[PDB]
Amino acid sequence: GGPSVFLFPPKPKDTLMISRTPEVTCVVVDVSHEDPEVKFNWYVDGVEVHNAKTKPREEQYNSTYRVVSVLTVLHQDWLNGKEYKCKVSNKALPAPIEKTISKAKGQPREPQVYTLPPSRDELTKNQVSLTCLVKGFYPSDIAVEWESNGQPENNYKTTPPVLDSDGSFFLYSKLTVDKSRWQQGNVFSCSVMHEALHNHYTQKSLSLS
């Protein structure tokens, strides 16, 4: 067989907010119980770097092993196309495995946010859904969140980026609330974080006139 490798990109919100810390993660699965020594080699646009933080291996219930190296990156570097290569070297492997990832190439496109109130037919229920349509953005890397009264509402579920017919993406975010909170006229806001948004952020409120 052979241990396997998967390279994971940073979280959209991590690359956009200067507060957060974006990291590219390198995972190694099917790591042999007898030859568990795993060595990582990280490279940015060719040049090797050494500030990756490798975590202690861990036997997986299927009696194998799993090792993970986390490379912290620069929001700019990721946003600027820089390429991140992870090179895994192990015994049970003829030659070190290599995986490379970078941000999607292509003209970014500022997203448009629209807040839709619940359908009338839904007011018969005890909870109603507030929708936040986010369309025409690119690349698909994006982060949607809801809040009210400054506080974050967490009972929401965003769909994953869907490719539209014009080559851009669009998704929808459904926040679920108590009819009571809604009809009471409270104000909710859908915030979107994207690279093509001024200051990588925007908001749209939603309530009952």
Partner: protein, 34 residues
């Protein structure tokens, strides 16, 4: 979250006057400041 650091960051990020080296430097600074 500081709405100001996000502004200085986006700002520095798209400053057409700074080069890769300067930008990084200016950005790092914004990072350490908050």
């Amino acid at each position: 979250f500081n709405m100001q650091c996000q502004r200085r960051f986006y700002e520095a990020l798209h400053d057409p006057n700074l080069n890769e080296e300067q930008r990084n430097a200016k950005i790092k600074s914004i990072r350490d400041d908050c």
